[PDB]
Amino acid sequence: LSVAIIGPGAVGTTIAYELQQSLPHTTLIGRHAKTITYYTVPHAPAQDIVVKGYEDVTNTFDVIIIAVKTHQLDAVIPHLTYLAHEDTLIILAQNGYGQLEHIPFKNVCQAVVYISGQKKGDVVTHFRDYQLRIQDNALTRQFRDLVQDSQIDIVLEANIQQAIWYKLLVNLGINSITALGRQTVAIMHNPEIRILCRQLLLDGCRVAQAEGLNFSEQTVDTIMTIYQGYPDEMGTSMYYDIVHQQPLEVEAIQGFIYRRAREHNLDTPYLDTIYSFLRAYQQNEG
Template sequence: MLSTPGRDPVAVVGPGAVGLALAARLAGQGHPVTLCGRPGTAPVSAVTSSDEHGMRTVDVEWRSEPARVHLFRWVVVATKLHQGDAARAWLERLVDSDTLVVVAQNGIEHRELVAPHVPRHQVVPALVHFNAERHDRDRVEIRQDGPGLVIGDDGPGRRARPLLDRTGLGVRIVTDFTTAAWRKLMVNAVANPLTALTCRRVEVFADPSVRNLAVTMLAEVAAVGRAEGARLPAEAVEDVLAWIDARPAGAGSSMLADRLAGRRLEYDGLLGAVVRRARTHALAAPVCTAVLALVAALDTAPSTRAAAHDTFKNQEQQ
């Protein structure tokens, strides 16, 4: 039986924007936090976070070698979806039968990411609804509107809630996590690829041709989600477009940011997951499949990244 979190040490795997945000909030509440990052990268010994209440710096411990960590009762996995191998290398050292693992990622395959190192009853899939933007390696800006984390109303979720409540980001616990995950995936599987491919922010969805493309993709995603058991109403496509339209001017996406920074793109766990599940249910998803192929080709062509950066800068100057 897991104890209440108290001020137990917490390991955070993945020092990206989400990982830094969660590490900063937990360390700020007195939890000793160990950040687990890639070998050879510059260490992070303190994290500075800013939000509407101001700025705060907290100390953390840094580890870049799995062999140098010990077992933890609480682990947060906040790596990108395509960094699953790196996450699993850490989990081999961090997790035992008493560990609860919060997987704070995009997509719908949270439990698959950490298998076989973590049994299902020790995994808490968490949908991230707060916005975190990393500045340098040790600074993160946090913005949110409403609950920042969504978890399922099951045994692992209820055990993890006291720890997640301490982040101050707001936790919503839902009985139908499948529907919540597919609602978020509808946004991520369409907005991320289309902004990355066009090198434009959310204003691109005002373009009639792009909007029509988005409508078709969203309808395909919704059909797959329903086949997976998600309760998505007929107006789900319009709801997602309305949400995108309401984003602040200049809002982008994580995939666009990764493309402009020359990083690998997180497409396989988003649009790739949709296409895989469509095939499982013998559903046609031709437009999502075509866009997935384009994004995958983009990700394997590093020479296009500098051109993407130049294109984006030119657009900003016009």
């Protein structure tokens, strides 16, 4: 079992570093060959990790982990013809729930990613966590055993939908507020912001229910409690994106919840307003 990671961003690089320690043939792939500086934690000693360009790959892989941004997914797909074979397990180490439809392979899996860090130029700094939550099946189970000497934590879920929706909602509240606010978590000091944040999660909660899940006001509480644990100066990925004038992962997150809202013909005023500012940002950035 051979393993490639596509997308030398923060998540992809962490996964590659950690897997490479016990599984040295594990390949990190991007657009161009290069060397990346990686820090397991801020101020730890520098480590080198090699990136291989698509052109440079000569073999196929039994497992492919895709870790680009959600909006970069389509650009990756055509390379899978040269990297994958028919039975290749394709794991999406990506936020939200992406355009899986677009991926022409038997074995595709949206993971839920709990791995934090940042990329700045060719420098990646990991912060905390090494976790991937994936659908239980014989392929993912085989992968979990392969990685048992690493600290990458593969959690196999009987039904991955719930895990996906839960993280959708954790992102929905704080990412939306910090990005549209152009502010760090400090923005949560405003009581009107906290109320909005709560209402936004209830909107998402109502969509989750319509999709089959027993999320409740209590679920909302646990999320608001996760948020209180955040420090004031913490940003979010979507906040960072908006501030550096980059595209957003909106379509796979807020966009995904919005589309499921219209499908079930629901009333989601907070979600709609947040989604429309986000979308309008995308259209201008583009």
